[PDB]
Amino acid sequence: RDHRKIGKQLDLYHMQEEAPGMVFWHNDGWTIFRELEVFVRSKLKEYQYQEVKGPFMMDRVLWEKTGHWDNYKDAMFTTSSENREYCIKPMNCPGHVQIFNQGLKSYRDLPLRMAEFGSCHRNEPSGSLHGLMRVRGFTQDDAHIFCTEEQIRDEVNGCIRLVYDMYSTFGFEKIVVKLSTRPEKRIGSDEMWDRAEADLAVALEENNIPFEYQLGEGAFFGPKIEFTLYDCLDRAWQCGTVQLDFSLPSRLSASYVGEDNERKVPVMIHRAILGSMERFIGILTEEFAGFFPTWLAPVQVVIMNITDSQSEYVNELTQKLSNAGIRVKADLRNEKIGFKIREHTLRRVPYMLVCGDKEVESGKVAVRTRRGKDLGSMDVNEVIEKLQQEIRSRSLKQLEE
Amino acid sequence: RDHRKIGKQLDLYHMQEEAPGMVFWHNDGWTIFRELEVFVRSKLKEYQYQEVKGPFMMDRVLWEKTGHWDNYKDAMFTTSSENREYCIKPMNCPGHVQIFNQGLKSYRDLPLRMAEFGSCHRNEPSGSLHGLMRVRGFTQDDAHIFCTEEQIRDEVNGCIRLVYDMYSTFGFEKIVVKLSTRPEKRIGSDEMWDRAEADLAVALEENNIPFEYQLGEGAFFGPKIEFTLYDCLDRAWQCGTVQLDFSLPSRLSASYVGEDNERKVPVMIHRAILGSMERFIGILTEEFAGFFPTWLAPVQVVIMNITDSQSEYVNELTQKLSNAGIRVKADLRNEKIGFKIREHTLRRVPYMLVCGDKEVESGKVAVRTRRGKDLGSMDVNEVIEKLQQEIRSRSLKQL
Ligand SMILES: Nc1ncnc2c1ncn2[C@@H]1O[C@H](COP(=O)(O)OP(=O)(O)OP(=O)(O)O)[C@@H](O)[C@H]1O
Ligand SMILES: Nc1ncnc2c1ncn2[C@@H]1O[C@H](COP(=O)(O)OP(=O)(O)OP(=O)(O)O)[C@@H](O)[C@H]1O
Ligand SMILES: [Mg+2]
Ligand SMILES: [Mg+2]
Ligand SMILES: [Mg+2]
Ligand SMILES: [Mg+2]
Ligand SMILES: [Zn+2]
Ligand SMILES: [Zn+2]
C-alpha cells in the first residue's frame, strides 16, 4: 500500500543518492503528472486564471526584501554568478509580484488571478524526506490572486469552492480542514494578523466547513487554510492551501490605481489546490493502491493475442485505439494469456482485451479488467466509445463497476 | 522587428536585473510556449518517444563521471546542501541515462527514444545575453535515443526528417546546416571521433543537405549537426541539433543485453528540434513581426459589442467559441467600438468579431482581421468551423 513500493512496481519514478529528495519521473509517472496538469488547466480556464512562468532563481537582495531571507534562509538553496548571490526559488509569490509590477494596474484589473505550475526547491533536512510526499524539488499548482479588500470574501470563497470541486473528482472521503495561525517568527502587525485570521475563519464558517485551529503553523507573512489528506498509515499531509497576505505586496512595492485615483496596495491570496504534484501523486497512489482511475492510468488498455495467428488483428486494434486517443499497448509475447493477464493486472492496467480466432473473425474483443472481472465479448467500436466516455468524464469507476 | 520590442508591446515576457538572463513569461507569452509544447508532443507521439522529467540538480560526482565538471565547469551553477556540492543541470543527458539505467534493457527495447522539455541553466557571460535568444535559463525540446550501431543511420535520419517536418510548419525559407567537428577539449578516442564525424557527414549527404564544416565546435562528447535560423538582422542562431555520442553511455555505465546475450553499450544520439523554447520563440517573433499564426496567437478572437444592448449576445458567443476550443475574449468595456478594434488590432489578435443589433437579430457576426481585411457578416457556426480548421491544420495564413 506504500506509494514507494507501488511506484517501483508500476515503474512510475525513481530516486537515487546523487540527488536526494529529487524525483526522476519515468514515462509512466510523468504521464500521471501530465494528466493532472491537464485537469488543473481545465479548472484554470473555467475559473479564469492566467498562467505564467517565473524564473528559477532571483537575486538574494529580493528575497531579503520579502523577509524570506531572515525567516526561510535555512531551507534555501543559493548559487552565485559574477559576484552576485541568487536563491533558487522556494516559493512562486515574489516572481508573480514581479510580473504584476510590469505596467500600470487599475482597480479595473482586479481580481487578477495568476497561476503557475511553479517548481520550488527547499533544502528539507534529509532525515525528513519521504518518497514523493516530502521532497526537495517539487511542483506546486500555485496561484496568486491580487484583489481589493472588498474582494477578499468572494476570492477566498472561490478558492474554497475550487478545492472541493477538484477533490470530488478523486472521491476523497477524509478532508480535514485547519486554520493555521500566526507563527512565532513573522512580519506584519498584530492588527493585520487578527484581520487576516478572522477573514479566513469567517470564510470557512460561511461555507459551513468545520475546521480546527492549528496554532503557529501559518506562513511568516500570513495565515493559511490547510486541506489535509491522509496516507495509508493515516498520517496527515498538507495538500491544498489558501493563504491571506497583507504584507508581501507592500514589501515588493505592488500597487494599483483605485477608483479615487489614489495609489493602493493589493491584497494577495496565495493558494495551491493539489498542493504539489509530487505529494498529491503520492496520496493518490496510496489512496487507490495503484488502481489509478482510467483517465490517470499510464497504460489504459493492453491488447493481447493468444497465438501469432491473431497478431495482425491485435496490431490493427492497437493503432485504432491509439488513433482514438487511448493509451494502448500490444502484448504479442509468446506466453499464455493467463500469464499476460496476471502481469498487466500487477501493472494495474484498467482493461485487457484478449483476441482469439473467434474475436478476429467477428471484429470483437474479449474484455478483462484488472479487478479480475470477465466482461464478455464486445464490439470494438462500442469499447472505444465506452472508454472515451470513461476518460473524458474522469470517471472513478470502470465499465459495469 | 526586434523580438524584445514586440515582446514588450504584446506583453509576452519581461526580464529584469534581479535575474539576468531569466525570463518572466507573462500569460500571453506562456500561451505561445505551451502551444509549442503541444505541437512538439504531437510530433513525438507520431515518432514514438517516451517523455520523462529529470531533476534540476545532481551531485558534482555524477558530473565528474561524465567529464562535464572538467569540460563544462565555469559555465555551471553550483549549490550545496549538508556538505555536498550539486550542479544545476546545464543539460539533460546524464539524467536520461540514469532513467535508462533503471531496469534491465535488451536489444528488444532499442531504439529507445526518451524526450524531455528539459530546463537548463548555464552561466553565460552577462555581456553575451540577448533577449530570448541567449539566456541563462532555458527549456530544450531535448531527447536522447539509445540504439545499436546498426540503428544509427535510421535514427539520425529520423531526427533530420523531424527537423524539416516541424520547421515546414513555420514556413522557414533559410535553414543553414553545419557539421561541427571535434573541439580542443573532448572525451573519446580519435577513431571514435573519425567514425562519428563520418556518420553525420554521410547522413547529411544522403539527405541531400548542403552543409559547411564548423571545425572545433562539436560537443565535448561528440560531433553535431547544427540547424541555423536567422533573426531580423540576419544573425545566425543555432536551433535544431543532432549529436552523435560514443562516449557518455560507457562513462555512465549504460548497457543492454544483445541478441547474443552479452552486455553491450548503447550508442546515444542527442537531439533538439526547436533548440530551446526561448530562442525559438525569439526567432518566431521576429520572423512573423508579432503576427503569430492563429494556432499560436495568445488570443485568437475578440468579440465586441457596439452598445450595451448587445452585451448579452457577445457573452453567449464568447462561451460558444471558448467551448469550441478557441482562445476568445469578450470586450464589453465602456469604449467606442473603433477604440476597441484598434486596441486588439495593435495586439495582433487574428480575428475581431463585432456585434451590432443586426448581428443579434440575425444570429450572425461581423468579422475583420488584424491586417485590416473586412470579411463582412458571417454565420457563427461558419466562423467557428473555419477557425477550428485554421487551428487544427496549424495554417500559416488566415482566411
Ligand atoms: N517538501 C515538500 N515536498 C512536497 N510537497 C511539498 C513540500 N513542501 C510543501 N509542499 C506542498 O506545497 C504546498 C504549499 O506549500 P507551503 O509552503 O504552504 O507548504 P508547507 O506549509 O511548508 O508544508 P509542510 O508543512 O508539509 O512542510 C503544501 O501544502 C504541500 O502540498
Ligand atoms: N544560452 C542559451 N540560450 C538559449 N538557447 C540556448 C542556449 N544555449 C543553447 N541553447 C539552445 O539549446 C540547443 C542545444 O544546446 P547545445 O548545448 O547544443 O547549444 P550550444 O552549442 O551551446 O549553443 P550556442 O552555440 O547557441 O551557445 C542549441 O542549439 C540552442 O538552440
Ligand atoms: Mg514545509
Ligand atoms: Mg505547513
Ligand atoms: Mg552555448
Ligand atoms: Mg553551438
Ligand atoms: Zn505564494
Ligand atoms: Zn544530451
Side-chain angles (χ1 to χ4, degrees), chain A residues 1-172 174-190 192-194 196-263 265-311 313-378 380-396 398-399, chain B residues 1-72 75-149 151-172 174-190 192-258 261 263 265-311 313-372 374-399:
Chain A
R1 195 109 211 192
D2 173 357
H3 73 277
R4 299 165 297 176
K5 294 194 197 309
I6 294 162
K8 183 183 203 181
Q9 162 162 150
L10 311 203
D11 183 39
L12 302 184
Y13 76 93
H14 85 272
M15 288 180 92
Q16 45 189 93
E17 298 293 329
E18 297 85 344
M22 301 307 182
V23 183
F24 297 76
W25 286 105
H26 301 186
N27 178 84
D28 280 3
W30 192 238
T31 293
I32 303 180
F33 195 118
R34 282 189 302 111
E35 281 290 350
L36 286 175
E37 287 188 313
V38 170
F39 177 53
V40 170
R41 269 170 186 141
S42 78
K43 293 292 175 199
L44 296 180
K45 177 175 176 181
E46 193 193 334
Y47 289 66
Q48 291 150 9
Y49 283 74
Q50 296 185 23
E51 191 190 331
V52 304
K53 188 74 169 185
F56 204 67
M57 61 183 98
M58 294 187 289
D59 195 327
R60 167 175 155 175
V61 176
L62 174 93
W63 296 100
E64 290 181 356
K65 195 39 157 90
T66 65
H68 275 88
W69 184 253
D70 305 309
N71 309 114
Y72 227 85
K73 65 166 84 63
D74 293 339
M76 296 216 249
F77 292 99
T78 60
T79 187
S80 62
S81 169
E82 306 189 358
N83 303 332
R84 297 174 58 183
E85 173 164 37
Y86 299 89
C87 296
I88 300 159
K89 64 184 185 170
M91 277 198 213
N92 307 297
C93 352
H96 289 189
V97 176
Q98 298 320 285
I99 296 175
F100 182 90
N101 286 351
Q102 311 300 291
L104 268 278
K105 298 278 181 303
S106 145
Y107 72 95
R108 305 165 183 124
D109 303 302
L110 315 184
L112 194 155
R113 310 190 190 88
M114 169 194 297
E116 187 171 348
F117 297 97
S119 312
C120 293
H121 291 77
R122 300 181 183 179
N123 189 19
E124 315 266 341
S126 53
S128 75
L129 301 178
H130 180 68
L132 294 182
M133 285 162 185
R134 191 167 296 288
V135 288
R136 279 179 183 177
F138 52 94
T139 306
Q140 295 174 325
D141 59 329
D142 210 5
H144 295 85
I145 301 169
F146 302 81
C147 66
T148 78
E149 289 89 334
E150 292 70 49
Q151 288 163 356
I152 291 171
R153 172 184 297 323
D154 276 3
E155 288 308 307
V156 173
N157 283 345
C159 294
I160 289 166
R161 180 186 326 129
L162 182 54
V163 167
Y164 285 98
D165 173 358
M166 304 208 43
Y167 284 16
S168 71
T169 293
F170 307 96
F172 292 138
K174 182 163 180 186
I175 307 158
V176 172
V177 183
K178 295 176 194 184
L179 202 178
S180 300
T181 56
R182 59 202 80 182
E184 316 208 291
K185 299 299 176 296
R186 53 182 193 269
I187 67 180
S189 66
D190 291 336
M192 289 149 71
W193 275 93
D194 299 329
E197 287 171 9
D199 281 357
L200 293 182
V202 174
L204 288 167
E205 232 170 299
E206 172 173 329
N207 285 269
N208 227 289
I209 288 148
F211 68 95
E212 31 181 64
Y213 297 92
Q214 181 174 48
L215 299 179
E217 275 314 289
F220 74 86
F221 52 82
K224 317 155 106 161
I225 298 168
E226 280 164 40
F227 297 90
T228 326
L229 302 176
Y230 294 75
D231 68 10
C232 60
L233 303 179
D234 205 42
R235 291 178 299 211
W237 291 99
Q238 181 186 321
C239 306
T241 324
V242 183
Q243 285 162 56
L244 193 44
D245 175 8
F246 300 155
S247 286
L248 290 199
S250 198
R251 289 294 185 96
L252 298 174
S253 296
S255 75
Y256 66 96
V257 184
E259 268 223 59
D260 40 51
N261 223 308
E262 293 283 281
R263 172 209 197 257
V265 175
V267 176
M268 197 168 72
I269 296 156
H270 317 221
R271 106 275 181 291
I273 309 299
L274 306 191
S276 67
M277 317 294 329
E278 290 78 4
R279 176 176 293 183
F280 198 77
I281 291 164
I283 291 287
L284 289 182
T285 301
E286 300 195 356
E287 172 68 350
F288 293 124
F291 291 87
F292 292 105
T294 295
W295 69 281
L296 279 177
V299 177
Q300 292 158 328
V301 174
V302 170
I303 309 186
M304 56 184 63
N305 56 340
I306 315 271
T307 72
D308 317 342
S309 157
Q310 309 96 6
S311 147
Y313 179 69
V314 165
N315 278 330
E316 316 164 7
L317 286 181
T318 300
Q319 186 65 58
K320 184 171 184 183
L321 269 65
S322 188
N323 293 339
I326 292 158
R327 295 190 286 276
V328 55
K329 302 286 217 193
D331 182 349
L332 300 166
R333 300 173 291 157
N334 176 42
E335 303 283 354
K336 176 224 180 333
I337 221 72
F339 181 99
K340 303 192 180 178
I341 288 188
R342 291 185 299 270
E343 184 181 325
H344 299 294
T345 293
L346 287 171
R347 299 287 281 206
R348 310 285 189 254
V349 174
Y351 299 97
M352 293 145 273
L353 310 190
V354 191
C355 296
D357 288 325
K358 197 222 145 292
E359 279 73 40
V360 164
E361 276 71 69
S362 37
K364 293 168 100 209
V365 280
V367 180
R368 312 281 299 270
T369 80
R370 61 186 172 184
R371 304 265 198 200
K373 305 296 179 63
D374 186 344
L375 286 211
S377 317
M378 320 169 39
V380 167
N381 295 305
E382 151 208 358
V383 169
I384 289 166
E385 170 155 59
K386 283 176 194 323
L387 273 35
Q388 284 170 333
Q389 180 46 201
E390 195 172 334
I391 291 165
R392 291 153 182 190
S393 66
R394 295 191 176 87
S395 171
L396 283 165
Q398 293 197 63
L399 292 168
Chain B
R1 277 163 65 257
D2 163 347
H3 72 277
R4 305 168 293 172
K5 286 185 177 105
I6 296 164
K8 198 206 128 43
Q9 285 159 354
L10 306 191
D11 198 37
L12 302 186
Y13 77 93
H14 84 274
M15 289 174 85
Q16 52 186 88
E17 269 311 288
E18 294 73 14
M22 314 302 252
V23 181
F24 295 76
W25 286 104
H26 301 197
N27 181 71
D28 285 0
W30 190 239
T31 297
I32 300 169
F33 191 120
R34 288 188 294 118
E35 208 56 52
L36 286 172
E37 301 188 315
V38 167
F39 176 54
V40 167
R41 283 183 174 123
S42 84
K43 294 270 139 199
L44 298 206
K45 187 200 173 154
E46 198 180 345
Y47 297 62
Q48 303 162 255
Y49 283 74
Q50 303 180 14
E51 187 187 333
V52 302
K53 187 79 171 178
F56 276 92
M57 38 206 152
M58 314 187 258
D59 199 304
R60 158 177 155 310
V61 161
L62 192 283
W63 297 97
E64 286 177 358
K65 277 185 181 116
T66 64
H68 287 113
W69 184 251
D70 280 324
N71 301 302
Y72 220 92
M76 295 204 270
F77 287 100
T78 67
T79 188
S80 286
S81 170
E82 311 190 357
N83 303 300
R84 290 168 64 181
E85 213 166 358
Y86 299 89
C87 292
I88 315 277
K89 65 179 175 161
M91 62 198 347
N92 306 300
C93 351
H96 287 191
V97 182
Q98 300 317 288
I99 292 170
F100 181 95
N101 285 351
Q102 293 307 293
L104 277 177
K105 299 286 180 297
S106 83
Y107 73 102
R108 286 185 282 280
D109 307 301
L110 310 182
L112 193 158
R113 315 186 183 88
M114 198 202 274
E116 178 179 356
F117 294 106
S119 182
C120 301
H121 290 84
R122 302 186 181 174
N123 192 15
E124 318 277 349
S126 56
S128 71
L129 302 176
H130 175 72
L132 301 174
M133 301 317 197
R134 193 169 290 300
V135 286
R136 285 196 174 161
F138 51 94
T139 300
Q140 302 179 323
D141 71 310
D142 197 14
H144 298 85
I145 302 171
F146 302 80
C147 69
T148 66
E149 283 73 11
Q151 289 161 354
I152 292 172
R153 172 178 263 91
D154 279 347
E155 287 311 306
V156 176
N157 279 346
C159 296
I160 293 163
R161 186 169 73 250
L162 194 46
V163 169
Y164 285 103
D165 181 7
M166 293 189 54
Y167 283 14
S168 73
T169 293
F170 309 94
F172 295 141
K174 187 161 178 188
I175 307 163
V176 170
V177 183
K178 300 190 208 294
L179 178 48
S180 309
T181 58
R182 45 196 93 185
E184 245 191 331
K185 274 286 253 163
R186 57 188 192 257
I187 60 182
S189 74
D190 278 342
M192 299 142 71
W193 276 91
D194 290 340
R195 179 168 353 111
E197 287 168 6
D199 290 343
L200 297 184
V202 162
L204 290 172
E205 289 188 349
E206 284 179 3
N207 280 277
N208 198 35
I209 294 164
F211 69 94
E212 34 170 54
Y213 278 97
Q214 228 171 17
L215 298 162
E217 289 308 287
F220 75 91
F221 53 76
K224 341 169 158 185
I225 298 166
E226 290 173 26
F227 296 88
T228 321
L229 301 173
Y230 293 76
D231 65 17
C232 51
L233 299 176
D234 218 23
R235 291 169 299 201
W237 292 101
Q238 169 190 324
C239 289
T241 183
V242 180
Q243 329 188 348
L244 189 53
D245 171 16
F246 302 150
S247 36
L248 278 195
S250 175
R251 298 192 154 223
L252 290 172
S253 301
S255 72
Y256 66 96
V257 178
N261 225 64
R263 220 176 154 290
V265 179
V267 175
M268 210 166 345
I269 295 147
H270 314 223
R271 106 285 179 279
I273 308 297
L274 306 190
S276 71
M277 304 287 149
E278 291 66 22
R279 174 173 295 181
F280 200 75
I281 288 164
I283 291 285
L284 290 184
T285 302
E286 307 206 345
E287 170 81 336
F288 288 108
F291 292 77
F292 291 100
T294 300
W295 72 279
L296 273 182
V299 174
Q300 289 160 331
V301 175
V302 174
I303 312 186
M304 314 142 255
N305 58 332
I306 303 186
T307 87
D308 288 349
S309 147
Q310 307 93 28
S311 65
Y313 182 65
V314 166
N315 284 326
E316 328 181 325
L317 290 193
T318 302
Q319 191 68 237
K320 177 174 235 232
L321 267 68
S322 151
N323 293 335
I326 297 160
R327 292 190 290 279
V328 56
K329 302 287 199 133
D331 178 351
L332 302 180
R333 287 178 296 161
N334 181 51
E335 310 276 345
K336 314 238 208 323
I337 184 60
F339 179 93
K340 300 181 184 183
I341 291 174
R342 181 55 181 163
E343 185 179 307
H344 305 303
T345 297
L346 267 187
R347 277 264 174 128
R348 317 304 190 200
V349 172
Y351 295 97
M352 286 150 284
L353 306 199
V354 181
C355 302
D357 286 310
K358 78 182 145 113
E359 280 73 42
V360 168
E361 175 191 50
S362 70
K364 281 159 136 73
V365 77
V367 182
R368 59 184 294 109
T369 78
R370 57 183 175 193
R371 305 257 182 211
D374 188 333
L375 301 180
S377 266
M378 308 174 42
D379 219 61
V380 169
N381 284 352
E382 184 208 1
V383 176
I384 295 181
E385 299 186 356
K386 306 197 155 135
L387 280 203
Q388 284 173 333
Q389 174 65 15
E390 209 174 321
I391 291 150
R392 276 200 316 260
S393 63
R394 301 191 170 90
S395 277
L396 264 172
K397 296 190 73 203
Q398 272 173 276
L399 278 41

